[PDB]
């Protein structure tokens, strides 16, 4: 019983956080067997922050420009190279802590786990969900460039986003492992923002699944719609189209439970188009998006 937004155990991570200092810029790495990846801006100073020509500041540097520091053992670098906005750094001992890892690319709508880091130290772990606008809604201080967010499965850690910045909502943009940013964002100073986002309907759903999994069932009712008609309900309250492999995923849920997905759909339009009424669904006063389908079937069934 219960349901709470849990993030993936992070041992397996922490053991491969370092910090990569340059100049007097300091931030978190990434430490995979002899590589150490991190934002590349760490070679930037602040005035040349608004147009940087990071190949000229890379060749400009040295091996021995780039202090790594795996807790008190210091790393000696061997070899420095970019990768679009990320930096490998070649040292000269393989990570002893390696997990067995991949570097995936998640689309939005799914969830990660990330590990915030500050001077190579881990701070703290949550669940993260990548919006629709390709921003996530992180926790994150200055000095958490470089912390990761990641997925877990049969002891294989799934890399998918590596924290490079703030933009002025207060939201977090980043890249994936192999340096390519979520979303059209820059790592310069510009006048870039968060484009609209949407809520992300077959998460709701997901959510609504394991509430009556957990015994919330206040908002059901009779009614069936259809797929149709609800998105045209959806597409009023800026939730994202529901698709036929959208309720072919949330199969396994509406079997457990009984209710098929187009009248958990008739739930949700009551919902977005009454509210609550002051009630609360799994603790919460509001419609939860941040929980796939994967994620009910985790913590419930």
Same mark, same amino acid.
């Given at each position: 019983?219960?349901?709470?937004?849990?993030?993936?155990?992070?041992?397996?991570?922490?053991?491969?956080?370092?910090?990569?200092?340059?100049?007097?810029?300091?931030?978190?790495?990434?430490?995979?067997?002899?590589?150490?990846?991190?934002?590349?801006?760490?070679?930037?100073?602040?005035?040349?922050?608004?147009?940087?020509?990071?190949?000229?500041?890379?060749?400009?540097?040295?091996?021995?420009?780039?202090?790594?520091? !795996?807790?008190?053992?210091?790393?000696?670098?061997?070899?420095?190279?970019?990768?679009?906005?990320?930096?490998?750094?070649?040292?000269?001992?393989?990570?002893?802590?390696?997990?067995?890892?991949?570097?995936?690319?998640?689309?939005?709508?799914?969830?990660?786990?990330?590990? !915030?880091?500050?001077?190579?130290?881990?701070?703290?772990?949550?669940?993260?969900?990548?919006?629709?606008?390709?921003?996530?809604?992180?926790?994150?201080?200055?000095?958490?460039?470089?912390?990761?967010?990641?997925?877990?499965?049969?002891?294989?850690?799934?890399?998918?986003?590596?924290?490079?910045?703030?933009?002025?909502?207060?939201?977090?943009?980043?890249?994936?492992?192999?340096?390519?940013?979520?979303?059209?964002?820059?790592?310069?100073?510009? !006048?870039?923002?968060?484009?609209?986002?949407?809520?992300?309907?077959?998460?709701?759903?997901?959510?609504?699944? !394991?509430?009556?999994?957990?015994?919330?069932?206040?908002?059901?009712?009779?009614?069936?719609?259809?797929?149709?008609?609800?998105?045209?309900?959806?597409?009023?309250?800026?939730?994202?189209?529901?698709?036929?492999?959208?309720?072919?995923?949330?199969?396994?849920?509406?079997?457990?439970?009984?209710?098929?997905?187009?009248?958990?759909?008739?739930?949700?339009?009551?919902?977005?188009?009454?509210?609550?009424?002051?009630?609360?669904?799994?603790?919460?006063?509001?419609?939860?998006?941040?929980?796939?389908?994967?994620?009910?079937?985790?913590?419930?069934?």
């Amino acid at each position: 019983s219960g349901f709470r937004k849990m993030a993936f155990p992070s041992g397996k991570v922490e053991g491969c956080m370092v910090q990569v200092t340059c100049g007097t810029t300091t931030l978190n790495g990434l430490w995979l067997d002899d590589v150490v990846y991190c934002p590349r801006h760490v070679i930037c100073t602040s005035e040349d922050m608004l147009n940087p020509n990071y190949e000229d500041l890379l060749i400009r540097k040295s091996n021995h420009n780039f202090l790594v520091q !795996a807790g008190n053992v210091q790393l000696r670098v061997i070899g420095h190279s970019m990768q679009n906005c990320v930096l490998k750094l070649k040292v000269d001992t393989a990570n002893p802590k390696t997990p067995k890892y991949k570097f995936v690319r998640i689309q939005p709508g799914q969830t990660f786990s990330v590990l !915030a880091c500050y001077n190579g130290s881990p701070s703290g772990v949550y669940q993260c969900a990548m919006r629709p606008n390709f921003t996530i809604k992180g926790s994150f201080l200055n000095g958490s460039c470089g912390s990761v967010g990641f997925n877990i499965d049969y002891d294989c850690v799934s890399f998918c986003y590596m924290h490079h910045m703030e933009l002025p909502t207060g939201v977090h943009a980043g890249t994936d492992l192999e340096g390519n940013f979520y979303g059209p964002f820059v790592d310069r100073q510009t !006048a870039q923002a968060a484009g609209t986002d949407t809520t992300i309907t077959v998460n709701v759903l997901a959510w609504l699944y !394991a509430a009556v999994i957990n015994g919330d069932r206040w908002f059901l009712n009779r009614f069936t719609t259809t797929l149709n008609d609800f998105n045209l309900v959806a597409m009023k309250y800026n939730y994202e189209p529901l698709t036929q492999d959208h309720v072919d995923i949330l199969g396994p849920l509406s079997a457990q439970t009984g209710i098929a997905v187009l009248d958990m759909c008739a739930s949700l339009k009551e919902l977005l188009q009454n509210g609550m009424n002051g009630r609360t669904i799994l603790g919460s006063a509001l419609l939860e998006d941040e929980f796939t389908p994967f994620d009910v079937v985790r913590q419930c069934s």
